[PDB]
Design an enzyme around this catalytic site. Sequence first.
Site, PDB file in Angstrom:
ATOM      1  N   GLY A  10       0.897  -1.191  -0.066  1.00 51.36           N
ATOM      2  CA  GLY A  10       0.005   0.048  -0.178  1.00 51.36           C
ATOM      3  C   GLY A  10       1.028   1.155   0.093  1.00 51.36           C
ATOM      4  O   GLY A  10       2.084   1.195   0.439  1.00 51.36           O
ATOM      5  N   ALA A  12       0.543   3.712   1.802  1.00 54.55           N
ATOM      6  CA  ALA A  12       0.687   3.909   3.274  1.00 54.55           C
ATOM      7  C   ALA A  12       1.919   3.347   3.624  1.00 54.55           C
ATOM      8  O   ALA A  12       2.703   3.682   4.326  1.00 54.55           O
ATOM      9  CB  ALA A  12      -0.512   3.272   3.982  1.00 54.55           C
ATOM     10  N   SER A 131      -2.485  -1.291   4.028  1.00 53.85           N
ATOM     11  CA  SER A 131      -3.525  -0.759   4.849  1.00 53.85           C
ATOM     12  C   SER A 131      -4.961  -1.963   4.721  1.00 53.85           C
ATOM     13  O   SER A 131      -4.595  -2.700   3.988  1.00 53.85           O
ATOM     14  CB  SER A 131      -4.270   0.524   4.187  1.00 53.85           C
ATOM     15  OG  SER A 131      -4.897   0.548   3.281  1.00 53.85           O
ATOM     16  N   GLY A 135      -7.513  -0.729  -2.161  1.00 52.91           N
ATOM     17  CA  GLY A 135      -7.600  -1.806  -3.083  1.00 52.91           C
ATOM     18  C   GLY A 135      -6.285  -2.789  -3.150  1.00 52.91           C
ATOM     19  O   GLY A 135      -6.665  -3.835  -2.850  1.00 52.91           O
ATOM     20  N   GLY A 137      -3.777  -2.263  -1.369  1.00 51.60           N
ATOM     21  CA  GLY A 137      -3.272  -2.576   0.196  1.00 51.60           C
ATOM     22  C   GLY A 137      -4.289  -3.774   0.860  1.00 51.60           C
ATOM     23  O   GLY A 137      -3.675  -4.369   1.419  1.00 51.60           O
ATOM     24  N   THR A 170     -11.722   7.622   6.221  1.00 51.34           N
ATOM     25  CA  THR A 170     -11.316   8.217   4.914  1.00 51.34           C
ATOM     26  C   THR A 170     -12.313   8.114   3.896  1.00 51.34           C
ATOM     27  O   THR A 170     -12.778   8.810   3.190  1.00 51.34           O
ATOM     28  CB  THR A 170      -9.898   8.421   4.310  1.00 51.34           C
ATOM     29  OG1 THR A 170      -9.835   6.942   4.017  1.00 51.34           O
ATOM     30  CG2 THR A 170      -8.850   8.706   5.659  1.00 51.34           C
ATOM     31  N   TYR A 215       0.505  12.686   8.141  1.00 55.47           N
ATOM     32  CA  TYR A 215       1.168  11.597   7.864  1.00 55.47           C
ATOM     33  C   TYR A 215       2.695  11.546   7.914  1.00 55.47           C
ATOM     34  O   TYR A 215       3.224  10.527   8.334  1.00 55.47           O
ATOM     35  CB  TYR A 215       0.520  10.993   6.285  1.00 55.47           C
ATOM     36  CG  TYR A 215      -0.792  10.559   6.414  1.00 55.47           C
ATOM     37  CD1 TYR A 215      -1.270   9.717   7.488  1.00 55.47           C
ATOM     38  CD2 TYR A 215      -1.330  10.714   5.244  1.00 55.47           C
ATOM     39  CE1 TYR A 215      -2.768   9.368   7.386  1.00 55.47           C
ATOM     40  CE2 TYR A 215      -2.839  10.300   5.369  1.00 55.47           C
ATOM     41  CZ  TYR A 215      -3.440   9.605   6.251  1.00 55.47           C
ATOM     42  OH  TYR A 215      -4.634   9.280   6.028  1.00 55.47           O
ATOM     43  N   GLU A 245      11.765 -15.911  17.886  1.00 53.26           N
ATOM     44  CA  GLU A 245      11.327 -15.828  19.244  1.00 53.26           C
ATOM     45  C   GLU A 245      10.361 -14.708  19.641  1.00 53.26           C
ATOM     46  O   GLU A 245       9.821 -14.836  20.608  1.00 53.26           O
ATOM     47  CB  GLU A 245      13.148 -15.143  19.633  1.00 53.26           C
ATOM     48  CG  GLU A 245      13.305 -15.175  21.222  1.00 53.26           C
ATOM     49  CD  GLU A 245      14.450 -14.642  21.608  1.00 53.26           C
ATOM     50  OE1 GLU A 245      15.366 -14.527  20.691  1.00 53.26           O
ATOM     51  OE2 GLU A 245      14.759 -14.387  22.740  1.00 53.26           O
TER      52      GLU A 245
END
EC number: 3.6.5.-
Lengths: 428, 426, 426, 330
Positions: A10, A12, A131, A135, A137, A170, A215, A245
């Site tokens: 994405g 983002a 995200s 789409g 994303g 959004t 952002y 781990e």
Amino acid sequence: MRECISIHVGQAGVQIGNACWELYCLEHGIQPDGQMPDSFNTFFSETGAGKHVPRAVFVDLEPTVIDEVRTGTYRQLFHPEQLITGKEDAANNYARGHYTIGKEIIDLVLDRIRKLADQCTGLQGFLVFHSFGGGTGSGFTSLLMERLSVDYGKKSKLEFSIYPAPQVSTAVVEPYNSILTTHTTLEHSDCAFMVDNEAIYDICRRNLDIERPTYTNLNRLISQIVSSITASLRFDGALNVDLTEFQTNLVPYPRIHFPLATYAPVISAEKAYHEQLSVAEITNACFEPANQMVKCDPRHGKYMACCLLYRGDVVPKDVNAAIATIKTKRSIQFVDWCPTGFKVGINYQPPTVVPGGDLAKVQRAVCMLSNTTAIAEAWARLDHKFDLMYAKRAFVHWYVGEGMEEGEFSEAREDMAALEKDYEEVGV
Amino acid sequence: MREIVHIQAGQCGNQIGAKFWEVISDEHGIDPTGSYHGDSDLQLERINVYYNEAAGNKYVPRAILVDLEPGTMDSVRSGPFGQIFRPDNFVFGQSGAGNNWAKGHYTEGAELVDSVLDVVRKESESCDCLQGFQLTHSLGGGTGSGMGTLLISKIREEYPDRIMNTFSVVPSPKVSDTVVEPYNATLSVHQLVENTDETYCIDNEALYDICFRTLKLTTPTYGDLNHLVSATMSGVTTCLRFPGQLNADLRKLAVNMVPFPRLHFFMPGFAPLTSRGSQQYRALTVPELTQQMFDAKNMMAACDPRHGRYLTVAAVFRGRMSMKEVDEQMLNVQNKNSSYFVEWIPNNVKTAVCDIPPRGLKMSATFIGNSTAIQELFKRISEQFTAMFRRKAFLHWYTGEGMDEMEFTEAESNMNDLVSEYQQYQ
Amino acid sequence: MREIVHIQAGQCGNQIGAKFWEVISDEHGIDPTGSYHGDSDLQLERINVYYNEAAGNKYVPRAILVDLEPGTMDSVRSGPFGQIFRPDNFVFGQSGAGNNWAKGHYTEGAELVDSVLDVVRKESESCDCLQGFQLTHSLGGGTGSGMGTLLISKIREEYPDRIMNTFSVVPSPKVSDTVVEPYNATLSVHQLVENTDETYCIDNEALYDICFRTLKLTTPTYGDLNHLVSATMSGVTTCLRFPGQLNADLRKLAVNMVPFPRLHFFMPGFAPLTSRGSQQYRALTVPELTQQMFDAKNMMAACDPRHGRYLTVAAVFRGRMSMKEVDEQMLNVQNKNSSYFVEWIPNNVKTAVCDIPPRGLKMSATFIGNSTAIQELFKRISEQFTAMFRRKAFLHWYTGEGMDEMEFTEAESNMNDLVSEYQQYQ
Amino acid sequence: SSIVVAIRVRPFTSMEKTRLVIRKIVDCVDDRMLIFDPAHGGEIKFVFDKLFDETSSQARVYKETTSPLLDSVLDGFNSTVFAYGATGCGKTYTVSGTPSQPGIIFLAMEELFNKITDLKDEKDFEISLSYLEIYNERIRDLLKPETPSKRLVIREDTQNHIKVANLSYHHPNTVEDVMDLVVQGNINRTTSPTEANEVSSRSHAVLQIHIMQTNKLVDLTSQHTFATLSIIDLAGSERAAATRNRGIRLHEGANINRSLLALGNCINALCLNDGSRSCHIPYRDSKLTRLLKFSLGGNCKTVMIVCISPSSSHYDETLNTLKYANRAKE
Ligand SMILES: Nc1nc2c(ncn2[C@@H]2O[C@H](COP(=O)(O)CP(=O)(O)OP(=O)(O)O)[C@@H](O)[C@H]2O)c(=O)[nH]1
Ligand SMILES: Nc1nc2c(ncn2[C@@H]2O[C@H](COP(=O)(O)CP(=O)(O)OP(=O)(O)O)[C@@H](O)[C@H]2O)c(=O)[nH]1
Ligand SMILES: Nc1nc2c(ncn2[C@@H]2O[C@H](COP(=O)(O)OP(=O)(O)OP(=O)(O)O)[C@@H](O)[C@H]2O)c(=O)[nH]1
Ligand SMILES: Nc1ncnc2c1ncn2[C@@H]1O[C@H](COP(=O)(O)OP(=O)(O)NP(=O)(O)O)[C@@H](O)[C@H]1O
Ligand SMILES: [Mg+2]
Ligand SMILES: [Mg+2]
Ligand SMILES: [Mg+2]
Ligand SMILES: [Mg+2]
């Protein structure tokens, strides 16, 4: 040895990537053209003397975002076979990301991933950024993760996802993509992370004293979080916690993929001169809702697991005292079946902050990875919003017009109900 | 990639379109010769979307002018567009419909459309990745309505996966220009709702109120009406052409615009609407933008949103803005005005923020409202249609074109069903 | 080597030929005195193909003018060609056929041809390596048709291994000049199909549409018709005269032009056809060339390719071009328009790219289409022939030359068989 | 009145027999209850109005399922037949298919003719047949697609009488020739040989029987009896990619899914309205549902006949298909 392949699905994730690789550059001393003046091998690979380039794949169907990279600072860093572009947008549509369009780019993407995998010697796992709203994303991430499972099997795959805020939304069909995608996440992800823009916006406003949050600095916080998580492998400290781990400590039952990554201490470059940021003080902060990166209230659930990744000038002795303190705090409720549900990492590598944001540089930081059952509440909110629209099949024709079957929504929703039920059971 | 083919159907469409292309050319630093004299990269970064870079670096609008009345071409060509628009884009017949939808659709338009589509196809092949079509016109009748309708149907058939986006002037409720507006609008709308993906309702009467009362202007001209419309058009595809802090673009937006195929008629608005004098008492902040943007008085369609319910509002911002600043205003508005939004749609307002403000502005915002209040437009027009149709008034102007009362009855019936659907969602 | 002997039969052939030789001389930097004033090597590299370098370095067109009407010679000689064309090349009688194929073939032409062939033989001996002959004329009748036919037959007999290439004006379907076009064309074509190797169908009516509508000209003159034809002729042997990135030349091309001996009647076209104004909205790329080149409206014969099927299209390009750019367009076109091509012929479009563009152009392309749609030309002419012949209208103008109805019947029959063959291959 | 949901399972073939030893995804336990799971959420139970399976003959399925609808047609109001499935489950097969097999179309006509013979002394039977095809949001004459698709006045009278364009209407006088018209329609019907379901019904179809009866007796009212019977075929449904759908192939899949979405939405709304005090169904949303304006939710009774593919290869498809049918009622 230990190497990572990052995948920025994405935008983002790309903008987070921009912040991350910007940060990694500063942390390893690597310039925008790959010039160095070692452990950086986990993220960068040498392509000739003084030419270290990032082991990452960027996937966009919408070159605009990639073009920002291709015309940005790190156009001299990333090469043309990392920055993968497509043709048509996914229209915020899981159906297009997973199918209609994404099916024509996934092949290219996988080939480039395989290239990087062939270039690896000790691939630890994949770092996927995306995200639950977009789409590509959503849908493409889903497509990709399925393919990654086919290609690499049990190789660790992390999903660093942007989680739809409870108020600060959004788009309108965010629930549609989120529900379909999370189903796939549960099926294929080895550990998933959730970031709430709303929670961070308030963190910025309050803890960083930011008048206008966005952002840019939000992502910088995320990069601090992710850097702290990966610090244990890329840097040699005291207690270096591996990805396996992390799974060992953060997963008591297969499906528990929550661990909220809380970064402390979110201090502005001003009050930092008055903040006595001791190990204990920072620890106290990280166990509060004041610094939680997802809008919720952990005190109404139970802590299944809690990993504290300390970084910088941190002393085990002081850490142990801080932990014991936390253990006496009745506000922190752990599950009865995990009396020992504490994990400590300590990495001797002072928190690195990149010029261009607030986040005061400190000598001590801790990333808390919290698996708290209260997250089912957030899931319920998402499911409810989905139900509100789904009840009227609103906007469903945008998915069905891409060939999406109604049952894909119904089945994913049912799985999401089961997810919450799993969080209910472990709370017992 | 993502090229858009623009069509200017009718004099209204040509005049609005000309203003649109003036605005876009201005924004991208392109002068009337086609030469680029800007100073950014973003001005050319997506210039392909709207222009073909001809030999000599001359950017030619990907736009086709469609008309039945010669001289209409010259009403554009005699201006700056004599060097901007291509001669092959001036596609026209030599008759005229005389505000008659059928003449511009079944007969005279049908004679022209063959040569229009030929030019359309040329541009379709010229495009590297067609995103869709954009049609500007009117419901007044003749070319804009009839020929516009015809083109939409024909092009939709050719490109069922690239549905045309439409900016159309709707019938005013008081400020009427002709008598048979109910016929031409009813017939066109009947077809439009079946073929178009998104329609912008442009009402000159509402725009007149904006120009006169909001902008404090003297005598609102067509150029002032088009200023407002072209401002909207630019806003709609700003995120297409330019980068922001996020981005759902055009089709990505469209997915969040309507929860149903038919109810895709939106009201457009523009935040920064004010006189030069009154600007001195205003602050450059999103809270000021949203107070103006969500003001029903500044709607460019003559329907008061508050009478119905919002299925969704798109808020497209231009200029460097805080996501927190914007989204907090969004939340405050939806919460405070929650009574005007549809209960079962979680988020009733969509955020999109592009970092490139309009020329002459430090910031702006575009309002695209999906409200059921628009049903008033369709209802009133249907009533006026009934008023005439019930007596067969002017009917012979269309039966001479091969039409019948059944077609008229169906067109009316369909519009009524559309209104009912708005009432149901309200 | 590879010399071509050009013949100008008839006034049409003389006027077109003159224009052709103007074009070639211009391309090769040769002025009207024969003196060479160019600047390349390629202008002289294959100048032998078309010119004899006479003492004083005077390049004399290897061309023979054949005619039955004195003064026709002067219609060329009185221009620049009084210093270009040799006096021995002005070979003519003193009668005239009066648009009568038989007069220009059996009688008056037969009287002249002896002296023409003598000049032909002189050039044949003058040539170092004759590649073939090139005849320009018309199907209107008289010299061009009759004498042209006669020369083809006689020369073919002498040089059965060097078949004459023919550029001939065909009968228009609406724009008729005389009445007995069906007779003269039918009689000539009957012979042409048996003797010629490649015939270009030149239709003034189609050319008129190009000049007027495509080139946006006022009053298309014969010089404008010839401009288009001479452009084609130059293109056909550009790869002969000049180097490219590959090269199948003239005979190498011919092998790929037709899959049969008889169906060798081609439609010619020229890509870059546009007004000076509209050039400003066009881009210099092969995709633009091919969109114009494959446009049926720009065909120089009045038959619409799309009504039949393509046996093959030769696409001859001029100027520096990418082989990928060109061939991708070729592939895209054949794939998209596959319905118009013959199914069982793998490659229906031939590529040839010469690196030397036309004077005044940065690039161009020549279209030579082998389509069965040309059958419409032959069919309609045959119908018109029938219309007259069935009544013996004007018949006595040919029976006075020793002809009979049997000859006419056979000529008609043969053309009908030709049409049938096109229908079969369609 | 209410929609009847009837479901029948297609038997196993060599495509499963050569796979065997594999598990059946459908566990029918009685005439209304299906169980559908191998454990993913545990046994999934469904309750329907009438179930059939691979042991029940289609002839009897007709007798119980649509034979009563043929009666419903002539109870003062018309009646129609709906269906559903995931392309290749049986929808087309169950009309008759094999010449030795009596099914929906065959028996509807055969039974009718028997009734016509007996009831000819009560009413005359002027009957005409209409063949509609639905493809890419276009309605064509299924029997003769040569007819310009624009020629169809999709409208009803104020009496709910069918008022459409001059379609190629045909009178019936036997079963075979009528079925031959259905077949000829299917011959001219758009399909896709490239799909697994050999001759998939890519376009939808409506076989509309227009029954115009008249009273053999003379009386004061002297009103005719118009009624109709529709046998409707669909393209079923496929995955968003459905295995590398390309261009128009994908577009077709979208269009049939849109058509079934609108249909399903109208069915859902109708069944929700069947209990409420309103019936706002946007039939305009698709030319199919516009055609079905009164077929679905007018003065009529109908049935949803779902075809099931028990093959292990179609688990998720049948899973949703059964849940879909349930949702259609609920
Ligand atoms: N908002 C705007 N409305 C306009 C403009 N020009 C005209 N109109 C309106 O549109 C109507 C007149 O429409 P047109 O000239 O486009 C009719 P058209 O040429 O399409 O067909 P003909 O009947 O052949 O003239 C009327 O309501 C005008 O008041 C304009 O620039 N802006
Ligand atoms: N395309 C062109 N067509 C021409 C040209 N000149 C004449 N023509 C056409 O050709 C026909 C007239 O032909 P000609 O003068 O060549 C007859 P010719 O001299 O060969 O024999 P005579 O009967 O002895 O005159 C007619 O269709 C003209 O319209 C030209 O320059 N270009
Ligand atoms: N935290 C954070 N969230 C972001 C950023 N950019 C976008 N988002 C969020 O991501 C979601 C939108 O998804 P995107 O990543 O833009 O969409 P995408 O993955 O590119 O998918 P398509 O564009 O539809 O192909 C929204 O919830 C945004 O608020 C960022 O820089 N930081
Ligand atoms: N009950 C059955 N017994 C035997 N064969 C069957 C049965 N049901 C379906 N088939 C077969 O499977 C193939 C049919 O698929 P049908 O034609 O049943 O698919 P469909 O539902 O009409 N597919 P679609 O049109 O895409 O929605 C046919 O050739 C049938 O013979
Ligand atoms: Mg994106
Ligand atoms: Mg006009
Ligand atoms: Mg002459
Ligand atoms: Mg079928």
